[PDB]
């Protein structure tokens, strides 16, 4: 495969690693989720334009809108957590251990 | 929540699941998962306490990560085949990505950590929905792509699910966490036979959903979420605790009850494939689930724990609401073993 | 595997139609009117054969027909045609609507000196038919033989012999 | 699989150094995986504490592998019995004894001797008789 | 689909975007239209198990069309072997390849 | 590529204007000069002042409306289809759903800047 | 000028390393929008004009914008900086060097096999040779959403309305 | 196994070729057990609802019984048709592939040498 595809898939892998390896902030993890979506968008767009799958041109639009809906949902969850604890720190989300 | 809004959100959850099960196109399957999650998040936060908020947040994080991995698997499959139809995956690493994503959505063992916490953090109705309806879509996708799964990966995850569900549930005094670990073990049982016979997976799923519905409805009827609170139920409604005991015995797979049917059929189908060590391991491991089921039965029906003085007040009162289909769910979860050959209807 | 067979360089030689896009556009309507036979014949070959190498001589005839069309324009009013395609050439979108005066005296040439009526709106977009001598390609896709299908189901349904035969069950 | 292939293709009761090295490699790899999961889910208080835990787990598992390989291969070549599950049983019990030494507890050592010896004997039996742990679907 | 509601009700809910050889707007062709068509016409109605072996050539040609991996290898070989002979002063590219 | 040259020129000239703007004047700075401006006194940092769920809700509702707008942008080319009745039905469907989202936010408090 | 998509993709991956090393979320968002801009450029070089402008208008000017707006409200008392942690530097440096090593290997070998097989013979090489006529094939494919994609419009619009209802359910806070 | 079977039309509980089999008898033991399951459901419904378990709501217990029998009859038909299909395909496959199912050459125990193992 051409090397642009290599770098796009590499970007997805880096976003996945950044999301799986957490830090204190929730917003950083949500931004990693967004990067994963953006890399998926670009990979889909490259594949669809290159093979001239014309009806599949609309698929990146659908992916973008649905992932942005999920991002809105995650932002609302972060805001609720912050209103509970004053911060978006994931270490405060540990009271379900017991 | 508004009753109309809650009904709409429930319907949207079921419609996302149905979109997953009726689509031939991977994009629409992904859409169905997205819709299911979007509508599911508010029903988790229905009570709105910090436990509910944390349960919803952990659920959202795991499900969104799984959905992104699933989309990446779809995109790799399209990159190598140009195919959107849900069928065998044409790429092995895309298949691995998809299998891991579906297992994380299901909550199999290496991705099981969210199930106990989320189940504990939400209400019993939310947990009932979580542990019954949310298993349908990923399992249906798995049954559709079963001919291309790596049997080693799937069987590893299923065996780990059985082991961890057995061990994790041993330490629990919370009924919701016990339900979650039982669910992990039963998901492992479902996914072990998936490479060999998807009809066995459907059968086991139906039996498990019947038992889980019966048990969760008995818990809601009892208003008990801890083992000690359930230990008071005999002094209020002993019929509920005796029915719960027979249901727990069914969950343990004790003959001649309905819970023995999926294990027996799966062991038979596995031995048909020269699989003998794994079924023996699985049947032996399920004794842990049966052990903590028997602990619950001891504390609930087979013995009588101390009650409280304030329980005399509750004696003069009936239930405002009645659980729907609970008698049917109880009979189905205990008494259906003579009807086993009807499983061919699922073919 | 296999050698992609290619035409030689002199199998590909032709008298080029070396006029620009504005010259081509100015004569395009009368070109479609006057050069339909070999043009439609070559387009038929190209869609029927799905092969550039199978339709080279038809394209070579396309070129010759265009060439003679332009030589017929040249000898009667090369000058009104020149003015018309110059005016077409000025605008950056090569629009017809800005050159109707020049198209007018180009069109009333070819009528009087050559007989060429200009096609009406929609005529040039019609699907027409061509009476070709070339045989219809048999396997334009170079398809392999298709796999033999799984045998169908015949016979009448009889009840399961001794039932399900699942373990101890008798029905 | 190449880690297991290099152990499997060398015959039993021959080249005991190579077989010991292969079993040591398997032990070290497995201990590295268990250390990774332990560090992930039960994190230490410092980087050095985690390094110490990783090294402890890794050496325990690698020593179990090396001891199992040495005892199994040597008891095979000494008795001229490379198809006998008894050499693998002795290997498993010696691995249990070194695990008991690593945890420095006789009870763990004895229980592990029994369990790992029986497990290794079963593994030898499955190798000889073609038992499948993950059987590929056929019917 | 797990429940083929579309084929029971005759509805086309998502089958229209499922392949690139399906009907396209303005009849714009897919890049691998013929390759996909040939593979689909080979593999039709014989099951996936049979289609995986008995339609291997069509699917290989399709995959080459989609990701021109072997074409890219051959082009890369020609390029790097050309350079392998520029350095030694062996091969002079001709006028129509330089301008 | 002409557009790339244009962007390069715009960015370069803006940064050059920064450099002249932010290095040419003669400076003499002390502590009380650069103190944060609070109308003659010192500001309180307090603790995370930019709060209130309404600022976040307007952002989220703008996000969802912007997604539906993304769905509406292909409309100028959508009117060029022969199947115009289906296209009109779907475009009007999307716009009714936009209106329904606006109405549901409106009636359920939503767009209000409450007490 | 000969290679444009490769610099764009390398910068894309660099920005991904930058924001996925997770500095304070405002710098993570800055890295994300830089990555989004260079990716919009990438798909512009492939003929995806509408799709790249969608990236811009809705991702960078919508979704992001909202992200930075929400970070500007739920942050730290001293909103953190990239430098403040050695972990950020270590993650960014490791990602940058794993980018450099693999791009060098692919450029000078053209047969790397990191999970997938890759050949950096170019990026123009895979483009096909043909005319698209008097329309943009991308725009015709996307405008088919209203004629071919009736089901897609139905489910997406329902999901967006449900999203509004869902956000208003969750954020009520009672 | 049976998912991709040819002619298998979607969402069809009994296909029309099932009408060639004998329908289950009305006193079928499995159907009677279906009715018994319904009766137990009615009794348990009385128990949970805190009504006299045997004599309360005879219409409700009766409806439990008849609805259970009603579903059981169609379940029995579908099960029997699936098993008939299974046997049909098995016999067709054995017929079409005689080489995979050879005619085994039968021999008597007078010519077959079985090993005797003493118990002693
Ligand atoms: C279901 C009916 C729910 C209901 O009463 O909604 C009223 C509805 C919502 O009222 P609300 O006050 O907003 O919410 C109350 C809560 O639901 C809490 O009210 P509750 O305490 O009465 O709830 C009991 C609880 C427990 O559930 C019940 O009591 C009834 C539902 C479970 C049994 C029946 C469904 C399964 C049948 C097939 C089983 C296998 C065979 O109900 C639920 O959890 C309902 C969840 C939403 C409906 C879908 C549930 C699917 C579960 C099974 C999944 C797998 C199916 C097979 C595949 O109001 C209407 O006007 C409608
Ligand atoms: C094949 C299809 C088989 C079924 C055909 C249709 C049967 C009748 C449909 C209506 C019906 O039974 O609704 C039950 C439906 C179930 O809710 P529920 O909470 O179980 O009701 C129990 C109350 O005691 C309900 O007590 P209630 O006093 O409120 O009402 C008495 C109730 C009588 O309610 C009953 O008899 C309860 C339902 C009994 C049968 C439920 C399942 C039927 C299907 C079989 C399931 C088991 C399959 C076993 C085999 C599986 C594979 C091995 O009858 C009605 O409400 C009128 C029915 C006609 C409209 O209840 C109602 O409609 C009333 C509420
Ligand atoms: C209204 C009746 C109208 C009428 O005139 O109907 C005539 C109708 C005429 O049918 P038929 O085929 O001409 O005559 C019967 C055949 O000669 C003989 O049967 P068949 O050759 O037609 O074969 C029926 C078939 C298919 O049958 C089945 O699939 C259903 C099996 C029972 C069917 C018959 C009874 C159903 C209704 C009563 C249910 C009572 C449940 C009590 C539960 C107690 C639990 C401790 O059986 C099998 O394939 C295998 C049978 C043995 C395995 C049974 C299930 C094993 C798994 C579960 C283990 C747990 C223990 C055993 C089951 C629970 C009972 C202890 O006969 C009956 O309704 C009675 C049939 C009695 C068969 C008994 C088989 C032995 C097992 C059950 C005995 C213990 C339970 C007590 C049963 C009797 C007292 C209630
Ligand atoms: C207790 C012992 C028995 C355990 C199992 C009891 C099951 C009771 C309920 C059976 C309902 C019917 C089972 C089959 C079904 O759901 O649909 C049959 C189906 C209905 O459509 P279906 O086949 O899509 O439904 C089942 C789903 N799959 C595809 C996985 C089998 O009947 C058909 O004829 C459709 C075949 C083509 C499908 C495309
Ligand atoms: C780069 C790898 C990570 C590293 O060098 O240090 C990370 C971490 C530092 O230690 P610590 O601060 O305890 O981590 C948990 C903080 N809550 O390290 C640890 O927590 C321990 C990691 C040990 C790894 C040993 C590998 C051999
Ligand atoms: C047998 C071999 C000889 C006995 C074992 C070796 C001697 C010994 O010291 O045994 C006792 C041992 C002491 O070690 P201890 O301190 O308990 O271990 C923890 C240390 N941190 O403590 C131990 O726990 C070691 C136990 C070793 C295994 C003992 C096995 C014998 C006992 C059961 C025999 C009968 C089993 C059933 C027979 C068939 C049915 C009748
Ligand atoms: C360590 C245990 C698992 C080892 C393993 O790879 O098992 C796979 C095995 C089949 O391969 P194996 O026998 O290991 O190698 C020779 C094959 N001719 O499959 C086997 O069943 C052999 C090894 C396990 C035998 C059972 C061990 C106890 C299980 C409880
Ligand atoms: C418990 C925690 C660890 C679980 C996971 C163990 C490793 C699982 C992944 C590797 C499995 C594998 O490929 O094993 C190969 C070996 C023989 O191969 P087999 O299992 O028959 O599968 C052949 C498929 N073509 O089979 C085996 O090695 C058996 C499994 C050994 C597990 C130790
Ligand atoms: C194990 C058995 C396995 C096979 C059967 C499966 C279970 C069927 C019953 C399930 C449980 C239902 C009753 C639940 C219970 O525990 O009820 C307690 C109750 C005690 O007495 P009390 O509540 O005072 O009675 C009120 C008036 N009946 O109990 C009772 O009153 C009665 C408890 C037994 C149920 C009645 C049995 C005999 C009924 C008459 C014969 C029925 C034969 C079937 C045909 C009926 C036709 C009308």
Q: Which of G170, B72, B56 has the alpha carbon at shortest distance from A63?
A: B72
Contact C144 E42 (CB under 8 A): yes
Please report residues of E whose CB lies closer than 8 A to that of G132.
28
Dihedral sign computed on CA atoms, order E8, E11, E16, E21: positive
Is D59 within 8 Å of D98 (Cβ atoms)? no
**3-state DSSP call for residue A89?**
strand
- Nearest 5°: the CA angle A44, A49, A54 is 100
Residue E50, classed as helix, strand or coil, is helix
Structure-token pair, residue B16: 């996302």
Given an 8 Å threshold on Cβ–Cβ distance, is C169 in contact with B344? no
What's the CATH number where A29 sits? 1.10.287.3510
Ligand 3 center from residue H37 Cα (angstroms): 12
Enumerate residues 109 to 138 of chain D having a beta carbon within 8 A of any beta carbon in chain B. Answer: 126, 131-138
Residue E97 neighbours by CB under 8 Å, 6+ apart: none
H and E: helices and strands count for chain F: 4, 0
B339 touches chain H (CB under 8 A): yes
Evaluate whether residue H114 is within a structural domain.
no
Beta bridge pairs of residue F38: F41
Check if the beta carbon of residue A8 is closer than 8 Å to that of residue G11.
no
Contacts of H83 in chain B (CB under 8 A): 341, 344
Which residues fall within 8 angstroms of residue G153, CB to CB, at 6 or more apart? Answer: F71, F90, F93, F94, G145, G146
Look at chain A and report how many structural domains it folds into.
1
Resolution value (Å, 1 decimal): 2.1
Residue A28: which of G67, D78, C14 has the closest Cα?
Answer: G67
User: Nearest to residue B182, comparing CAs of B285, B93, B69, B272?
Assistant: B285
Tally of domains within chain H = 1
Residue nearest atom 32 in ligand 8 by C-alpha distance: D133
G4 contacts: CB under 8 Å, gap ≥ 6: G45
User: Is B275 in the D-facing interface, judged by CB distances under 8 Å?
Assistant: yes
Inform me whether the C-beta atom of residue A6 falls under 8 Å from chain G C-beta atoms: yes
Ligand 2 and H71: CB distance under 6 A: yes
Residue of B249, B242, B139, B157 whose CA lies nearest to B199: B139
Across-strand partners of A89? A25
Query: Closest approach of chain H CAs to the CA of E22, in angstroms?
Result: 22
Residue nearest to atom 37 of ligand 9 (CA): H54
d(CA E25, CA G142): 10
Contacts of residue C170 in chain B, CB cutoff 8 Å? none
Cα–Cα distance measured from residue B281 to residue B189, given in angstroms and rounded to the nearest whole number: 11
Q: Please report whether residue H22 resides in a domain.
A: yes
Angle between helices B175-193 and B114-121 (to 10 degrees): 140
Size of interface B-D (CB pairs under 8 A): 30
Q: Name the nearest CA neighbour of A12 among A38, A47, A49.
A: A38
- Among B14, B39, B52, pick the best mutation site for testing chain G contact (most G Cβ within 10 A): B39
What method did the depositors use to determine the structure?
A: cryo-EM
CB contact under 8 A, H1 and B197: yes
DSSP assignments along C129-145, one per residue:
-----SPPPS-TT-PPP
Return the structure tokens found at F9: 């020129």
Structural tokens at position C115: 């007989």
Task: Work out the end-to-end distance of chain B between its first and last CA atoms, rounded to an integer number of angstroms.
Answer: 41
Buried b (16+ CB within 10 A) or exposed e, D61-90: bbbbbbbbbbbbbbbbbeeeeeebbebbbb
Task: Spell out the SS3 assignment of D76-102.
Answer: HHHHCCCCCHHHHHHHHHHHHHHHHHH
- In this structure, the residue with its CA closest to atom 23 of ligand 7 is D123
Dihedral sign from CA coordinates of B48, B51, B54, B59: negative
Give yes or no for a contact between G142 and A57, defined as CB atoms under 8 angstroms apart: yes
Q: What is the DSSP letter of D11?
A: P
Residue A97 lies in a domain: no
Instruction: Round to whole Å and give the CA distance between G92 and G13.
Output: 11
Q: Choose the mutation target among B340, B341, B343 for the interface with C, i.e. most C CBs under 10 Å.
A: B341
Task: Specify whether the CB–CB gap between A30 and G7 falls below 8 A.
Answer: no
Helices marked H in C8-149: 21-26, 28-34, 36-49, 56-90, 100-109
Q: Can you tell me the distance from the alpha carbon of G149 to that of A57, in angstroms, rounded to the nearest whole number?
A: 11
Task: Tell me how far apart the alpha carbons of residues B267 and G42 are, in angstroms, rounded to a whole number.
Answer: 54
B164 CA: distance to closest CA in chain D (Å): 15
Q: How many CB atoms lie within 10 A of CB G107?
A: 13
Six token digits for residue F83:
């199947």
Q: Does B12 sit within 8 Å of G158, measured CB to CB?
A: yes
Calculate how close chain B gets to C42, using CA atoms only, in Å: 33
Reading the block at residue C71, the tokens are 């030589």
Contact H40 B331 (CB under 8 A): yes
Interatomic CA distance for residues G79 and A28, integer angstroms: 13
State both tokens at F113.
Answer: 């800047």
Cβ-count burial of G125 within 10 angstroms (0-12 exposed, 13-18 middle, 19+ buried)?
middle
Ligand 5 pocket by C-beta < 6 Å: which residues?
A: D 39, 43-47, 50-51, 54
Tell me, yes or no, whether H28 lies in a domain: yes
Tokens of D4: 């297991």
At residue G1, the 3 state secondary structure works out as: coil
- Which ligand minimizes its atom distance to the CA of D23? 7
C-alpha to C-alpha distance for D64 and D58, rounded to whole angstroms: 10
* CB of residue C166 inside a 6 A radius of ligand 3: no
User: How many Å lie between the alpha carbon of B156 and the closest alpha carbon of chain A?
Assistant: 22
Kindly write down the DSSP assignment for every residue of chain H, as one continuous string: --TT-TT--TT-SS-GGGGGSPPPPTT-HHHHHHHHHHHHHHHHHHHHTTS-TTTS-HHHHHHHHHHHHHHHHHHHHHHHHHHHHHHHHHHHHHHH-GGGS-------TTTS-PPP----
d(CA F91, CA F83): 13
Q: Domains, chain F, ranges and CATH?
A: 1-108 (1.20.58.1610)
Q: Return the number of other C-beta atoms located less than 10 Å from residue C39's C-beta.
A: 19
B276: chain D residues, CB-CB within 8 Å: 131
C170 lies within 8 A of chain H by CB: no
Let me know if residue H70 belongs to a domain.
yes
Domain membership of residue A98 (yes or no) is no
Residue C108 · residue E3 · CB < 8 Å: no
Query: Which own/partner contact pairs does D53-60 have at CB distance under 8 Å and 24+ positions apart?
Result: D57/D31, D57/D32, D58/D28, D58/D31, D58/D32, D59/D31, D59/D102, D60/D31, D60/D99, D60/D102, D60/D103
* Ligand found nearest the CA of H57: 2
Identify all chain E residues contacting C143, using CB atoms and an 8 Å cutoff: 38, 41
Structure-token pair, residue G151? 């089901």
The CA–CA distances, whole Å, from D49 to D42, D54, D57 equal 12, 9, 12
C-alpha span between B233 and B244 (Å, rounded): 11
Query: D127: CA distance to ligand 6 center in Å?
Result: 31
Which residues in B lie closer than 8 A to residue A29 (C-beta atoms)? 61
Which CATH number describes the domain made up of G4-172? 1.20.120.1200
Chain centroid to Cα G87, Å, comes to 24
Q: Is the CB of B22 under 6 A from ligand 4?
A: no
Of the candidates H77, H1, H92, which has an alpha carbon nearest to the alpha carbon of residue C171? H77
Range(s) of the domain holding residue H79: 1-97
φ, ψ (nearest 5 deg) of residue G118:
-135, 150
Pairwise CA distance, residues B101 & B82, whole Å: 21
Residue of H nearest to C161 (CA): H87
Whether the CB of A93 is below 8 Å from some CB of chain F: the reply is no
| Contact at CB, A72 and F56, closer than 8 angstroms | no
Name the residue among G106, G104, G91 with its Cα closest to residue A22: G91
CA-based torsion, D6, D7, D12, D14: positive or negative? positive
Q: How many CB atoms lie within 10 A of CB E88?
A: 7
For ligand 9, atom 36, name the residue with the nearest CA.
Answer: H54
Contacts of E17 (CB under 8 A, 6+ apart): A55, A56, A58, A59, B25, B27, B84, G148, G149
**Separation of alpha carbons C159 and G26, rounded Å:** 72
Ligand 5 centroid from CA A92, angstroms: 21
What are the CA-CA distances from residue H41 to residues B320, B325, B342, H60 (Å)? 21, 9, 20, 10
Q: Quick one: closest CA in A to E73, which residue?
A: A1
CA–centroid distance, B273 to ligand 8, in Å, is 16
Comparing CB atoms, the residue among G151, G156, G170 nearest residue B42 is G170
Q: Say how far apart CA B306 and CA H98 lie, in whole Å.
A: 72
Of the candidates E15, C120, G146, E17, the one whose C-alpha atom is nearest the C-alpha of residue F82 is: G146
User: What distance in Å separates the CA atoms of residue A41 and residue D53, rounded to the nearest whole number?
Assistant: 42
> Which bound ligand lies closest to the C-alpha atom of B340?
4
* Pocket flag, ligand 4, residue B70 (CB < 6 Å): no
Could you tell me which residues come within 8 angstroms of residue C127 by beta carbon, excluding any fewer than 6 positions away? none
- The dihedral through the CA atoms of D106, D109, D111, D114 has a sign that is negative
Q: Which residue has the tokens 């500007």?
A: G72
**CB of D103 sitting under 6 A from ligand 6:** no
What the block records as the tokens of F48 is 């995370």
- Give G67's contacts in chain A (Cβ within 8 Å): 27, 30-31, 34, 71, 75
Helix ranges restricted to H, chain B: 3-22, 26-44, 50-81, 92-106, 114-121, 124-132, 136-144, 151-170, 175-193, 198-222, 227-230, 238-251, 260-271, 277-297, 311-315, 326-335
How big is the CA angle at D15 (ends D11 and D16), to the nearest 5 degrees? 100
Flag if H11 and E47 touch (Cβ within 8 Å).
no
Return the exposure string of B12-26: e unless at least 16 CB atoms fall within 10 Å of the residue's CB, then b: bbbbbbbbbbbbbbb
Which residues form the domain of A73?
Answer: 3-92
Q: Which of G6, G118, G173 minimises the CB distance to A1?
A: G118
Q: Is residue A17 part of a domain?
A: yes
> Closest approach of chain B CAs to the CA of H111, in angstroms?
33
């Amino acid at each position: 495969m051409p090397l642009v595809y290599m770098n796009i898939i590499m970007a997805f892998a880096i976003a996945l690693a950044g999301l799986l390896m957490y830090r204190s902030h929730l917003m950083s993890s949500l931004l990693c989720l967004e990067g994963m979506m953006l890399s998926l968008f670009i990979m889909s767009t490259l594949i669809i334009l290159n093979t001239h799958f014309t009806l599949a041109n609309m698929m990146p639009i659908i992916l973008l809108v649905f992932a942005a809906c999920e991002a809105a949902l995650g932002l609302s969850l972060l805001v609720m957590v912050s209103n509970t604890y004053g911060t978006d720190y994931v270490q405060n989300l540990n009271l379900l251990q017991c | 929540m508004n009753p109309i809004i809650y009904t709409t959100l429930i319907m949207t959850v079921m419609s996302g699941t149905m979109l997953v099960m009726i689509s031939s196109h991977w994009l629409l399957i992904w859409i169905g998962f997205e819709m299911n999650l979007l509508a599911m998040i508010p029903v988790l936060m229905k009570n709105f306490n910090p436990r509910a908020t944390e349960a919803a947040t952990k659920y959202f994080l795991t499900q969104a990560t799984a959905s992104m991995m699933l989309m990446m698997a779809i995109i790799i499959n399209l990159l190598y085949s140009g195919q959107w139809t849900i069928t065998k995956m044409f790429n092995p690493v895309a298949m691995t990505m998809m299998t891991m994503a579906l297992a994380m959505k299901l909550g199999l063992s290496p991705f099981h950590f969210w199930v106990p916490e989320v189940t504990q953090g939400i209400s019993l109705q939310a947990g009932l929905l979580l542990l019954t309806w949310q298993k349908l879509a990923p399992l249906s996708v798995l049954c559709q792509i079963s001919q291309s799964i790596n049997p080693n990966l799937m069987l590893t995850m299923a065996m780990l699910s059985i082991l961890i569900g057995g061990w994790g549930g041993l330490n629990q005094t919370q009924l919701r966490k016990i339900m979650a670990y039982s669910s992990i073990a039963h998901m492992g049982w479902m996914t072990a036979v998936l490479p060999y016979n998807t009809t066995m997976t459907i059968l086991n799923l139906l039996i498990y959903i019947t038992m889980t519905l019966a048990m969760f409805m008995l818990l809601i009827h009892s208003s008990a979420t801890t083992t000690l609170s359930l230990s008071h139920t005999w002094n209020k409604m002993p019929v509920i605790t005796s029915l719960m005991m027979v249901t727990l015995l069914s969950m343990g797979g004790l003959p001649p009850l309905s819970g023995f049917m999926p294990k027996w059929m799966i062991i038979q189908e596995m031995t048909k494939n020269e699989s003998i060590i794994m079924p023996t391991l699985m049947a032996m491991t399920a004794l842990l689930n049966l052990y903590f089921y028997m602990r619950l039965a001891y504390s609930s029906s087979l013995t009588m724990f101390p009650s409280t003085n304030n329980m005399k007040m509750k004696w003069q009162f009936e239930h405002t609401k009645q659980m729907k289909l609970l008698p049917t769910m109880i009979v189905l979860s205990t008494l259906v073993l003579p009807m086993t050959p009807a499983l061919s209807s699922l073919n | 595997p296999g050698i992609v067979e290619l035409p030689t360089l002199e199998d590909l030689k032709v008298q080029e139609v070396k006029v620009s896009s504005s010259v081509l556009k100015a004569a395009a309507h009368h070109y479609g009117a006057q050069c339909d036979k070999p043009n439609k014949e070559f387009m038929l070959c190209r869609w029927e054969e799905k092969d550039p190498r199978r339709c080279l001589e038809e394209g070579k005839l396309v070129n010759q027909c265009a060439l003679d069309f332009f030589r017929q324009i040249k000898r009667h009013c090369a000058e009104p045609f020149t003015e018309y395609w110059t005016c077409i050439d000025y605008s950056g979108l090569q629009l017809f609507r800005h050159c109707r005066k020049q198209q007018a005296k180009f069109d009333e040439c070819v009528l009087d000196k050559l007989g060429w009526v200009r096609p009406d709106l929609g005529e040039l977009s019609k699907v027409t038919k061509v009476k070709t001598d070339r045989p219809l390609p048999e396997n334009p896709y170079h398809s392999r033989a298709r796999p033999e299908p799984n045998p169908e189901a015949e016979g009448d349904l009889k009840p399961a012999k001794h039932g399900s035969r699942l373990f101890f069950w008798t029905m | 699989k190449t880690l297991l292939h290099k152990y499997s293709d060398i015959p039993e009761g021959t080249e005991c150094h190579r077989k010991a090295y292969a079993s040591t490699s398997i032990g070290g790899a497995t201990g590295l995986i268990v250390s990774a999961y332990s560090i992930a889910l039960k994190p230490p208080a410092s980087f050095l504490e985690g390094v110490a835990r990783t090294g402890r787990y890794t050496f325990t598992s690698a020593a179990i592998g090396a001891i199992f390989g040495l005892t199994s291969c040597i008891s095979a070549q000494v008795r001229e019995k490379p198809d006998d599950p008894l050499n693998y049983f002795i290997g498993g019990c010696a691995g249990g004894l070194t695990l008991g030494a690593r945890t420095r507890s006789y009870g763990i050592g004895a229980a592990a001797c029994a369990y790992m010896g029986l497990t290794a004997a079963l593994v030898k039996m499955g190798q000889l008789e073609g038992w499948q742990v993950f059987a590929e679907p056929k019917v | 689909p797990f429940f083929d509601v579309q084929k029971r009700l005759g509805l086309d809910l998502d089958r229209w975007m499922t392949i690139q050889s399906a009907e396209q707007p303005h009849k714009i062709p897919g890049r691998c239209h013929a390759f996909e068509k040939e593979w689909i016409e080979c593999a039709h109605g014989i099951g996936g198990i049979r289609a995986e072996k008995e339609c291997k050539i069509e699917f290989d040609d399709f995959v080459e069309c989609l990701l021109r991996q072997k074409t890219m290898k051959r082009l890369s070989a020609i390029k790097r072997q050309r350079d392998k002979l520029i350095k030694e002063g062996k091969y002079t590219p001709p006028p129509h390849h330089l301008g | 590529m002409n557009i790339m040259l244009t962007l390069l020129t715009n960015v370069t000239l803006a940064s050059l204007l920064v450099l002249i703007a932010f290095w040419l004047p003669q400076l003499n700075a002390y502590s009380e000069k650069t103190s944060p401006y609070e109308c003659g006194f010192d500001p309180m940092g307090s603790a995370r002042l930019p709060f209130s769920m309404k600022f976040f809700l307007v952002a989220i509702t703008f996000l969802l409306f912007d997604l539906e707008i993304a769905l509406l942008l292909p409309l100028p080319w959508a009117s060029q289809t022969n199947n115009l009745k289906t296209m009109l039905t779907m475009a009007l469907f999307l716009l009714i759903l936009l209106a329904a989202s606006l109405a549901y936010e409106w009636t359920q408090k939503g767009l209000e800047w409450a007490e | 000028t000969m290679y444009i998509a490769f610099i764009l993709s390398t910068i894309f991956v660099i920005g991904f390393v930058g924001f996925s090393s997770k500095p304070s979320p405002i710098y993570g968002g800055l890295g994300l929008i830089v990555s989004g801009g260079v990716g919009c450029g990438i798909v512009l070089n492939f003929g995806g004009s509408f799709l790249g402008l969608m990236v811009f208008l809705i991702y960078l000017g919508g979704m992001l914008v909202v992200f930075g707006y929400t970070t500007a409200m739920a942050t730290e008392m001293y909103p953190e900086v990239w430098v403040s942690n050695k972990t950020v530097f270590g993650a960014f440096v490791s990602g940058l060097m794993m980018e450099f090593c693999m791009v060098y290997y692919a450029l000078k070998e053209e047969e790397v096999e990191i999970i997938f097989k890759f050949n950096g013979l170019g990026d123009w090489v895979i483009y096909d040779t043909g005319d698209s006529g008097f329309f943009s094939e991308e725009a015709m494919g996307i405008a088919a959403l209203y004629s071919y994609g009736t089901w897609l419009v139905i489910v997406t619009g329902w999901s967006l309305l449900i999203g509004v209802v869902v956000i208003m359910e969750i954020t009520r806070g009672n | 196994m049976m998912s991709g079977r040819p002619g298998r039309v979607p969402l069809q509980f009994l296909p029309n070729e099932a009408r060639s089999l004998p329908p289950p008898k009305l006193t079928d033991p499995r159907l009677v057990y279906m009715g018994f399951l319904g009766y137990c459901s009615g009794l348990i419904d009385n128990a949970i609802r805190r009504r006299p378990v045997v004599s309360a709501g005879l219409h409700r217990q009766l409806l439990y019984v008849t609805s259970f029998v009603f579903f059981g009859y169609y379940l029995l038909k579908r099960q029997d048709y699936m098993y008939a299909l299974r046997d049909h395909d098995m016999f067709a496959y054995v017929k079409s592939h005689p080489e995979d199912f050879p005619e085994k050459d039968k021999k008597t125990y007078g010519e077959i040498l079985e090993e005797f193992h003493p118990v002693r």
